[PDB]
Design a protein around this ligand. Structure first.
Ligand SMILES: *C/C=C(C)/C=C/C=C(C)/C=C/C1=C(C)CCCC1(C)C
Ligand SMILES: [Cl-]
Length: 218
């Protein structure tokens, strides 16, 4: 199994999620539609990014490594949508959304920038992202959880389930980044991509399926 193959697998998984979310939201009352649309965009954008990488585009040479630019474009656009989904579920107002969305953006921008910087100073960008990430986790586990507590028992339960999925799985990315080509380059590009393809699929499609389950049960 090579990079190309791993990218195709990611494209296929994202496509399956995209189609399922689009279908399940066919009707969608008039206030629940928002959730389905966000899911379609999250997995849809990732699907495109993976096909692009699978076709060999965006493989940017940096120092003695390769940076998959599409992955980062994908993250920068999709992770804020995931955060939006959680904030909607938690019942946040504009100001609340604004804070978590910017922290999220700082994480992804710093990571992309760090990956694109050849020198050892790139770790300074990585650190910036790590710090903003802790801020994001704080909001997810604190204020946003407090806000969610004002919703029905089911919604609060779905929020908690997805919050846990997000906090735990997202916290893993920085380590894979630090151990792979972007950092120490211990893990080969293939192993790093394999691990990240799984993580992307679960944080997006796994995330979506869990939500659909809750919606159905509700
Ligand atoms: C669908 C894609 C997802 C859910 C991607 C998530 C990515 C992260 C949580 C990345 C985090 C990073 C840090 C916390 C430190 C700086 C470097 C990053 C970008 C790998
Ligand atoms: Cl990369």
């Amino acid at each position: 199994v090579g990079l190309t193959t791993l990218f195709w697998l990611g494209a296929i998984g994202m496509l399956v999620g995209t189609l399922a979310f689009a279908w399940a939201g066919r009707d969608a009352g008039s206030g629940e539609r928002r959730y389905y649309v966000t899911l379609v965009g999250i997995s849809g954008i990732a699907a495109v990014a993976y096909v692009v990488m699978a076709l060999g585009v965006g493989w940017v040479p940096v120092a003695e490594r390769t940076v998959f630019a599409p992955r980062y474009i994908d993250w920068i656009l999709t992770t804020p949508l995931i955060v939006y989904f959680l904030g909607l579920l938690a019942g946040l107002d504009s100001r609340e959304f604004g804070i978590v969305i910017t922290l999220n953006t700082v994480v992804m921008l710093a990571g992309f920038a760090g990956a694109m910087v050849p020198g050892i100073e790139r770790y300074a960008l990585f650190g910036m992202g790590a710090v903003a990430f802790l801020g994001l986790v704080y909001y997810l586990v604190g204020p946003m959880t407090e806000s969610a507590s004002q919703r029905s028992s089911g919604i609060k339960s779905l929020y908690v389930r997805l919050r846990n999925l997000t906090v735990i799985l997202w916290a893993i990315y920085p380590f894979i980044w630090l151990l792979g080509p972007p950092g120490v380059a211990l893990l080969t590009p293939t192993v790093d991509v394999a691990l990240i393809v799984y993580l992307d699929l679960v944080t997006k499609v796994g995330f979506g399926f869990i939500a659909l389950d809750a919606a159905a049960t509700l």
